Structure formats: C-alpha cells, structure tokens
C-alpha cells in the first residue's frame, strides 16, 4: 500500500450540501480531477491541456479531519479520480446526517465516501490514482499574471442565460471590460451580431478606460457559469488582453480560480 492516510467527517448540513455542489460543478468542468490533501486544506485541481484551482479551508467544513503524507516535510497527498464518481457519491451525501471520507485499500486504493442516511449507510468506493511526488510540481497553483483590467462580475444568472442562448448562434465569444465598470459579451457572424452590455459593475482599486478583451471558446465560459448555481460573495473577472480571462471567485470561504485561455 502507500503509508499515507486520510480521514475526514462532515456533520454540518450546510457545508455538507455546499461540499456536494462543488463536486457537481467539477463534473461539468472536466471528467478527470486531481484532489490535494493537506493538514489545513483540501484542493480540487484541473490541469487542462483551461486550469481550475479550488481551495477549501478544512476547518470550515469538517468537524473531524486527519491526514499524513508519505514523508515528513512533504506532508501532502495527491490523488486522481473521475469527477462523475465523486459527484454521484456526494449526491447521496447532499442531505445526510453525516458524511465520512477515508482513504482505503481493500481491493485497490480508494477514496471511500460513507454517508449516514435517515440507520442507513451508503458506501461509495471511489477508485483513485496516487500521484508520485515527482509530478507534484505540475500540480501547483498557477501564478497570477497581472491583469490589464480587473472588474467585478454581474449576476452570474444573467451571464449564464445570455451566454447560453448565444451558444446557439456561435461558439466564439469576445469578452471585454473597462476600468470604468463596463463589461461586454460579444458574438459576431456573417448574418447576425449580438452584443450584451453590462454597466455600473465597478472596479477593484489598484490606464485609460479602453477595452481589454479576449476571444474565447464560449463553451468553456458556459461550463463555469452553469457550475455556479448561486451568486458568490466575491466575483472578480481579470482580463489579460488577447491572452487569458481569469475568474477569481470566493463563496463562503471557498476559493475558486478558473482560467480560460484565449482561442485564436
């Protein structure tokens, strides 16, 4: 076996379904996900090649939490699993009394999800791939390149609705923003041009308010917005002109960084 170990437990129903929704939004974004276990944190990592970095402060979800890496100073655990598996497993966990997550190796290395129902126990043994330390270097949180424009996002529901019906028209979307609080979504074809204007969004502080834009795949954006079935406490859009759009979302002590590279 590996001599790393992990066990955690959720009993707070609020963080428990909160944990569920995070799993379901990951299933939409990618089919394969990497989980990172630390003594203080839990990370969900996507390494598309469209990066995704999701961080959970452990002590805001679990009333019990304990882990141990293989080595001493490298006290981390990196796992690879299928997104659908975790989502289906946490479907039952969404409205339970309690939820247990533990690393097991019965038939094979697994992330066992135990769910206490109204007693009735549901056990899902999620197959996991243990990532060796050599490859941890490719699974770090991305550096944050200074954006040309940083702007607060509008309501994600209007964004989702607009983008989603724009998908029917085209797959190519241009998104742009100001330091004056404006953000535009824009598709353009031979027979129809559509531009949605958002204003009075405001900007986080710290040169002329001209548009910083980026041409992206509208499907990438839609996946991310669909996964946001709620409005967050903090929604930042960071645009690196003609290179990348970066979404910095905070939602009740749950960090979510999503990177969409420019197409073209």
């Amino acid at each position: 076996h590996h001599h790393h170990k992990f066990r955690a437990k959720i009993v707070d129903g609020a963080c428990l379904n909160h944990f569920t929704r995070i799993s379901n939004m990951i299933a939409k974004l990618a089919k394969t996900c990497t989980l990172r276990i630390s003594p203080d944190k839990l990370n969900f990592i996507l390494c598309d090649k469209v990066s995704m970095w999701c961080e959970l402060e452990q002590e805001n979800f679990f009333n019990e939490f304990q882990m141990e890496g293989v080595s001493a100073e490298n006290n981390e655990i990196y796992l690879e699993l299928t997104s659908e598996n975790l989502s289906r497993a946490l479907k039952t966990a969404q409205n339970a009394r309690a939820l247990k997550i533990k690393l097991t190796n019965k038939h094979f290395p697994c992330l066992t999800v135990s769910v206490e129902l109204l007693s009735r126990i549901v056990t899902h043994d999620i197959p996991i791939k243990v990532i060796p330390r050599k490859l941890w270097k490719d699974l770090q949180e991305p550096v944050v390149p200074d954006p040309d424009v940083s702007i607060y996002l509008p309501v994600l529901k209007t964004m989702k609705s607009v983008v989603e019906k724009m998908k029917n028209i085209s797959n190519h979307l241009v998104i742009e923003a100001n330091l004056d609080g404006e953000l535009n979504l824009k598709i353009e074809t031979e027979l129809v041009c559509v531009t949605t204007h958002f204003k009075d969004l405001g900007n986080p502080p710290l040169n002329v308010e001209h548009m910083a834009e980026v041409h992206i795949d509208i499907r990438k954006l839609l996946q991310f917005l669909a996964g946001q079935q709620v409005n967050p406490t903090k929604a930042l859009c960071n645009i690196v002109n003609n290179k990348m759009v970066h979404f910095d979302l905070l939602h009740e002590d749950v960090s979510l960084q999503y990177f969409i590279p420019a197409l073209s």
């Binding site: 289906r88 479907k91 039952t92 094979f108 126990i121 549901v122 056990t123 899902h124 043994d125 999620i126």
Partner: protein
C-alpha cells in the same frame, strides 16, 4: 373476450403495462377463468413477468369469445394506448378491451370523447410457467418505498445488483461489475428494522438485473404495496412478488452463478 375497466383501476392497469414494458418487447394476453393474464419475457428468456387481473378487477369480464384467446401484441403498440398515466387519470373514465382480427381498445373519456385503438395481434402459445415461491428457502418482504429508497443511490445505468444477507441480520445492496479501468462500487446497508419479514441465513447473496427489478418495483411503489423477494442459491432464479386485492404480480429473474 370483453374486459371493462373503470374508476382508479384503469390507471393501475396502465401502470402494469408500463411495468411490463421494462422487461420484454412483446405482450402476451391470456383471458383465463381466474382473470386476465398479462405476461412478457426477456429477450434471452432469463426474465419472466406476469400480472393477473381478477375477474372482479373489471366492471365487466368475459373470458370467452362466443374459441379462447391466446395472443401476443407488440409491447410498444399496447404501451402506446396507456402512454400517459396522467391522461388516464384525468380524462379516461372507462377502458374497454374487446375482440374480428384486431384487438380493440376503447377509452371512454370526459365530455363524451372516445378514443379507439385497433391493435393487430398474433395467435401464439401460452406463457404460463410454474414458479412457486414456497420452494424458495430464503425470503424478504418490505414496503416497496423502502426498497425504492435503497436503490436510489445506484447509477440509473447500473445493470446488475447484489442482494445479500450480512452480519447482524442486515440486508446489503451492492452494485455488481464485470471484467482496464476500475468501477466505483456502491453499497447500501439496511437494518432488518425496515423489513417486515426476513428469513435467510448469513452470507447468502444473489445477483440479478437491476433494470428489470426497477420495472416491478416502480409498480409496487406507486401503489404503496409490499414487495416479497423469494430466492435460493446463486444461479437459481429469484421470485419477486406483489399482491393486491384484485390483482397479482410476480416477476422471475435469473441470478448469476
């Protein structure tokens, strides 16, 4: 043959057809002295399903045609008549199944509306086969809604399920998997508390088709009936039984070796 169904019974008849349609592709109709038999079989004949509607289930029941009907209809075509259980409950007041070379199904609906289906059929063999639950040493009984809850965690596309008797008189429901990438296993553990009867020794486990089991269970759920499971050893068939006042339903499923 003339069958007349009225009141709430028209919907449960429709429910029975829906339940049967999740087992086989052809519906076998056999009007008997003890009522109307609706049967179907697996594509591989490893599953067998039967609903028997008592004569008093009908407001009018005549088995004989002044010979004796032993008939088969494409399941799709017969399911087509009872497609919408909502329409059956809201608009359909009476259903008449009569017999000519076509099987005539009339729906007497509200506001004098009448819908007539002329279904083609083929004369065929009886699908009667003996399957006595009393021969089975092991037995479970529980409310269908209890079992419906137990099956909820599994994937909708899950083919096989394992029903086992575990330590502490607990009933185990575990997903089954064949065969190079490993599958997540799901296990629901029930206490005997939710079961009305449990007669089976330890370590006894049978594996059968979940898709077909869902077929019968769905009928017993929307009727809030009890479902009995009679079984033996792995490789031997499992007999699933539901009973109501004026109708009997029993499913026979082969189990894995």
């Amino acid at each position: 043959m003339k069958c007349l169904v009225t009141g709430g019974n028209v919907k449960v008849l429709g429910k029975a057809v829906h339940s049967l349609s999740r087992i086989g592709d052809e519906l076998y109709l056999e009007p008997l002295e003890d009522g109307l038999s609706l049967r179907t079989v697996n594509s591989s004949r490893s599953a067998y399903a039967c609903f028997l509607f008592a004569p008093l289930f009908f407001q009018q029941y005549q088995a004989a045609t002044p010979d004796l009907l032993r008939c088969k209809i494409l399941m799709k075509s017969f399911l087509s008549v009872f497609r919408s259980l909502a329409m059956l409950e809201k608009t359909v007041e009476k259903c008449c199944i009569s017999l000519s070379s076509r099987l005539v199904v009339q729906l007497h609906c509200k506001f004098g509306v009448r819908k007539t289906h002329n279904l083609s059929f083929q004369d065929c063999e009886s699908l009667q086969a003996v399957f006595d639950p009393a021969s089975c040493p092991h037995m479970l009984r529980a409310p269908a809604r209890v079992l419906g809850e137990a099956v909820l965690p599994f994937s909708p596309a899950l083919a096989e399920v394992t029903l086992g008797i575990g330590r502490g008189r607990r009933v185990i429901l575990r997903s089954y998997h064949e065969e190079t990438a490993k599958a997540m296993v799901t296990e629901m553990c029930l206490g005997e508390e939710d079961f009305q009867q449990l007669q089976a020794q330890e370590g006894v486990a049978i594996t059968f088709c979940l898709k077909e089991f869902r077929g019968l269970l769905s009928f017993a759920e929307s009727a809030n009936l009890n479902l009995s499971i009679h079984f033996d050893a792995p490789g031997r068939p499992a007999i699933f039984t539901i009973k109501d006042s004026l109708l009997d339903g029993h499913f026979v499923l082969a189990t894995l070796s």
